[PDB]
């Protein structure tokens, strides 16, 4: 990672911590045990949900969109219509893939 904490000087995670993302593990005379940290986990949850909602709200819903018909003497406009459809589809595919790829990192 960019900060060298996860898989850095802390080599692995804990499967015994079930109620949070980051926490502590203590051990003394009384006994040992795990305990999650609430403030950092809450802030991270807020940020992640905000990011997901922002991603969702930027892509509007598709309405009705059906095809057209052309005769045998109207090939130019038919080709233009096909070109427009293909171009828009390609642009939106590129946008979606790039957005996901960047937000994961």
């Amino acid at each position, epitope marked *: 990672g960019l900060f060298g904490a996860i898989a850095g000087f802390i080599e692995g995670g804990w499967t015994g911590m*079930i*109620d949070g993302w980051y926490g502590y593990h203590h051990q003394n005379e009384q006994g040992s045990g795990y305990a999650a940290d*609430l403030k950092s986990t809450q802030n991270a*949850i807020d940020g*992640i*949900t905000n990011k997901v909602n922002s991603v969702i*709200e930027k892509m509007n819903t598709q309405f009705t969109a059906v095809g057209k018909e052309f005769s045998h003497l109207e090939r130019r406009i038919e080709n233009l219509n096909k070109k427009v459809d293909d171009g828009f589809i390609d642009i939106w595919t590129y946008n979606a893939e790039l957005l996901v790829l960047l937000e994961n990192e």
Partner: nanobody
Amino acid sequence: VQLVESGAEVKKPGSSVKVSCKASGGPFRSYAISWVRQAPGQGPEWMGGIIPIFGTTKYAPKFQGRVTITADDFAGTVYMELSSLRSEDTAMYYCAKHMGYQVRETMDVWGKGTTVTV
């Protein structure tokens, strides 16, 4: 934040009833959601709740084994289903939201509720 439930339900002994709760705002929540019922002339009772992202569900020992709480995240909906319905199950039902992402005693926003009758 506004929480709304479905309509009133009238059913028969031995049936199963599924109710839903819808919250305003973004489809994804940062708070847990619990289900609370009240009997006529009685105090409120707590069935269980659901936690965001982690998805763990907690239930009370009285309703354990016959209550199921699920969530549709992209629709922003929470479903609670009760099975093996009996005579005493008639009550007034609410979905309540918590202040944080964990199930606790502090529920700050309640819905109007729906009535379940046998």
